[PDB]
């Protein structure tokens, strides 16, 4: 879904600030030609819409959309690809239209799309084209949100933007309830190695698969184990076949990052109760059981790249070695004999990765420095240590040492004698603050990871995993997640409806080999032709017990929960089930960011913000307004002089703190003197 | 000059009571 995006206005088009909202609205010819659901939710709403599912580009650069043509009521199978023009020449029926199972409709008055962007009822003779299927107007990512027809468009927007933000877990287990789009969406995304020609496995491994084709030839398939993606996440490829396996052409042979068994898998299936629990799930916060932390159910891998280079300079040339001035062998005990750290060395914050030293030159020293050198007998150490240090917060083992050299005659930038990249990876567990979400935009950070004993547990002894908030469900109009929860419980426990009357009435249009189901069996509700209310409740009637005779969930869908903390049963039963949630790429250590005293800017004297640095916070304009409104003059003076720009004031603040003395008076800010010098330089006598 | 910065509040002399100086 970073492929197949349509950018509406940009280079060779209108500017983002210049464009109004006439571009941002959805013209009624977007049906089947551009998805109205999937868009960025920021300022770029409606400018960046993805392609549809069945859409196809014309040679003339137009967006064809296929249609089953209907002739004399009989809808044929002549699929005709139509542009917007021939859309507007005709009238178009819908897929939710009762066919006779022989081509014709059974009702003469059919829903239809009038060519002026209108909807009419029509005699069943004048329509000449029908949609190929449902879900024709939806995106690829939005085609994977089940129970979409119950959800609201805003929360579907948040869910479709939430789908392409998951991180690949280490287990990568498939959802118990999906659509029919996960499988083809996986094998067309390219991140799964496909069995190209139909053959038999000659040898399986962990890095390669030697298929043996049916005519002599062989082929390996080199897995990319632990490849770094463009956002730090892992890209493993575990093979799925065994030694004597005969494969077919176009078959999945190795799951990628977010794939299980061939099909897509963005998260795990999790038990969930919808009660409000002790204010920890307050205002769209989520709690989790500790079983996720201990059992490694939600655990990503972040392969991070650090990179330093050995250039030349005016005073000589920088060099990479073990020798670092004024340093001990204790910090040096991990790097190799030539300076880099070895593979598998665990690092922490502020360790050395590449011991790098440059010629400082020779300067005059302070007399106290000279006296300490004379006392301890040490030399000047005339070469400056500027070694690569692993920055703040990052840790984990060192996977790879990618090192290049100009002396090894590779191509290198001008002046760089050696380039060395070091890949560090941390196996991040789940934690409080990690932004979790469902598949319907029901997002929320993890409020508190409870231990598994004081987590509200189901009446057989099963503790639930997460506990959502009730009040986030109705006022956001995304009860698609509640229907998904009920269906997830149904598909988890399995069912077998009665056959004494054969088909009960709700089970009529319900297709066959669904009247019974084994437990832990996956199902797929498609987007606009899926499960209904009557089918869901009737299937939830017979919901075969766990191991004993214990129907844990009533026909209402709820269940009786004993409180793990207090001990009493909860006085009203609570909706449970198996929601399919994911873990998103908004983790805490990507965001938590503090600074006491770090680097500064160059032209201005402000602390250089940004998490790449230690980084301040932009104390903006409205914050100045609010602290004016409190009347707090002194704190405003601190924030605008001696935490920001008073150069001689800052070191006096530091001295007064570590000496434990009173904070001195703020001096003149540096930016004001900059303004004074500019205004004097504009031939204005600023007396 | 708004709140703590105004001249009626910024120029406060603070010193203990002479009874309290006789307490120690």
């Amino acid at each position: 879904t970073h492929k197949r995006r349509l950018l509406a206005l940009g280079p060779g088009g209108l500017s983002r600030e210049r464009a109004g909202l006439e571009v941002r609205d959805v013209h009624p010819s977007h049906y089947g030609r551009m998805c109205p659901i999937e868009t960025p939710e920021g300022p770029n709403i409606g400018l960046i819409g993805s392609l549809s599912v069945y859409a196809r580009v014309n040679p003339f650069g137009f967006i064809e959309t296929p249609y089953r043509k209907v002739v004399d009521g009989v809808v044929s199978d002549e699929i005709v690809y139509l542009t917007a023009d021939e859309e507007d020449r005709h009238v178009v029926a819908q897929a939710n239209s009762p066919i006779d199972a022989d081509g014709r409709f059974v009702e003469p008055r059919v829903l239809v799309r009038r060519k002026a962007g209108e909807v009419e009822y029509v005699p069943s003779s004048e329509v000449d084209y029908m949609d190929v299927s449902p879900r024709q107007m939806v995106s690829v990512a939005t085609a994977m949100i089940p129970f979409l027809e119950h959800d609201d468009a805003n929360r579907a927007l948040m869910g479709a933007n939430m789908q392409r933000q998951a991180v690949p877990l280490v287990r990568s287990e498939a959802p118990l309830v999906g659509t029919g789009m996960e499988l083809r969406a996986a094998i067309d995304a390219g991140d799964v190695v496909v069995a190209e020609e139909s053959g038999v496995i000659e040898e399986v491994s962990a890095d390669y698969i030697t298929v043996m084709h049916d005519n002599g030839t062989r082929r390996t398939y080199r897995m990319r184990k632990f490849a770094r993606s463009n956002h730090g996440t892992c890209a493993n490829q575990c093979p799925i076949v065994d030694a004597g396996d005969r494969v077919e052409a176009g078959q999945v042979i190795a799951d990628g990052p977010c794939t299980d068994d061939g099909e897509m898998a963005l998260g795990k299936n999790l038990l969930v109760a919808i009660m409000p629990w002790e204010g920890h799930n307050y205002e769209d916060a989520i709690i989790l059981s500790n079983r996720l932390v201990e059992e490694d159910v939600l655990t990503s891998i972040h392969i991070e790249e650090h990179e330093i280079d050995a250039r030349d300079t005016k005073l000589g040339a920088e060099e990479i070695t073990r020798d670092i001035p004024n340093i001990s062998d204790e910090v040096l005990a991990d790097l190799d004999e030539r300076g880099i750290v070895r593979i598998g060395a665990e690092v922490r914050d502020g360790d050395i990765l590449v011991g790098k030293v440059t010629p400082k030159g020779e300067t005059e020293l302070t007399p106290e420095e000279r006296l300490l050198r004379a006392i301890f007998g040490e030399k000047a150490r005339e070469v400056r240590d500027t070694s690569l240090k692993v920055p703040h917060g990052e840790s984990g083992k060192v996977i790879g040492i990618r090192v290049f050299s100009r002396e090894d005659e590779d191509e290198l930038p001008a002046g760089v004698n050696e380039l060395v990249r070091v890949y560090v990876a941390q196996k991040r567990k789940i934690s409080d603050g990690d932004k979790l979400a469902g598949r319907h935009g029901n997002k929320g950070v993890i409020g508190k990871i409870l231990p598994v004993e004081d987590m509200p547990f189901l009446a057989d002894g099963t503790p639930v995993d997460i506990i959502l908030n009730t009040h986030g469900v109705p006022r956001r109009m995304n009860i698609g997640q509640i229907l998904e929860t009920h269906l997830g419980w149904c598909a988890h426990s399995g069912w077998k409806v009665d056959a004494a009357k054969g088909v009960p009435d709700w089970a009529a249009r319900l297709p066959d080999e669904l009247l019974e189901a084994q437990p832990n069996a996956i199902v797929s509700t498609p987007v606009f032709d899926g499960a209904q209310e009557a089918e869901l409740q009737g299937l939830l009637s017979c919901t075969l017990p766990n191991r004993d005779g214990d129907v844990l969930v009533d026909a209402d869908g709820k269940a009786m929960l004993f409180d793990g903390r207090s001990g009493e049963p909860f006085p009203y039963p609570v909706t449970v089930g198996y929601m399919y949630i994911m873990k998103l790429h908004h983790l805490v250590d990507d965001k938590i960011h503090a600074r006491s005293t770090g680097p500064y800017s160059m032209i201005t004297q402000q602390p250089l913000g940004g998490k790449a640095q230690f980084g301040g916070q932009r104390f903006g304009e409205m914050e100045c307004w609010a602290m004016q409104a409190y009347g707090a003059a002194y704190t405003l003076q601190e924030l605008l002089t001696i935490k920001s720009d008073d150069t001689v004031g800052r070191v006096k603040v530091y001295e007064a703190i570590v000496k434990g003395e009173n904070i001195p008076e703020p001096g003149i800010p540096e930016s004001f003197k900059v303004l004074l010098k500019e205004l004097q330089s504009l031939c204005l006598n600023v007396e | 000059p708004a709140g703590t910065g105004i001249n009626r509040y910024r120029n406060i002399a603070v010193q203990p009571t002479e009874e309290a100086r006789a307490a120690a």
Partner: protein, 225 residues
């Protein structure tokens, strides 16, 4: 009042699970009693699990072994479901030696004395003709969950791959009461508790250890006067 000492009993269903019915308990009290035993059993039973492993072929957690189908992290996630009980508080080591194609079961671990694998048929990994699996595992006592202990928190070399550990012989605990509550005020609760262990110890032993810990803790309210 009702004047009869409460009684504990036993009911074995299977090997690694059983029931314990207590009678008679005070009204509105069997729930709290079962919950207290549940929170003890589910959290604070001392046992033993693996701590860190060492494979000869690899140096860190995030690579492969030439000859197997899974990799190091997949073998880690398989080995976290091992159950083995020690009797010695020292960290002992076991060994695993394998060659040739075939599935590497957990029962092919050669252990030292005192430790006992209770899940022999757990499939760890599978091998090919070039397969070569050779790994030692460090078993260690403990209780509750412990995080993966860092190698800078230790001082060990690159061979150690620190694993998480879950020292918990329990697997599943529930309780359910039977409040009699007749209209003659001889009303009592009959707590029926169900424990399920993961085959390390018997439920009788787990419950006896949990009740022993609670006997230790409740004298703190008692034996300060």
């Amino acid at each position: 009042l009702i004047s009869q000492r409460p009684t504990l009993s036993e009911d074995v269903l299977t090997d690694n699970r059983s029931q314990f019915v207590i009678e008679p308990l005070e009204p509105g009290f069997g729930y709290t009693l079962g919950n207290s035993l549940r929170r003890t059993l589910l959290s604070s039973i001392p046992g033993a699990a693996v701590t860190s492993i060492r494979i000869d072929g690899v140096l860190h957690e995030f690579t492969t072994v030439p000859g197997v189908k899974e990799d190091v992290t997949e073998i880690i996630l398989n080995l976290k479901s091992l159950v083995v009980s020690s009797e010695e508080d020292e960290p002992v080591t076991m060994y695993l030696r394998k060659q040739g194609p075939g599935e590497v079961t957990a029962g092919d671990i050669v252990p030292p004395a005192g430790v006992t694998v209770h899940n022999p048929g757990m499939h760890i990994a599978t091998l090919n003709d070039k397969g070569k699996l050779e790994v030692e595992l460090v078993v260690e006592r403990g209780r509750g969950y412990v995080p993966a202990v860092q190698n800078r928190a230790s001082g060990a070399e690159i061979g150690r791959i620190p694993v998480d550990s879950i020292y918990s012989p329990v697997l599943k605990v529930t309780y359910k009461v039977d409040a009699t509550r007749v209209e003659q005020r001889t009303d009592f609760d009959k707590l029926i508790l169900d424990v399920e262990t993961k085959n390390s110890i018997s439920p009788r032993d787990a419950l006896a250890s949990a009740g022993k810990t609670l006997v230790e803790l409740f004298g703190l309210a008692r034996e300060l006067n």
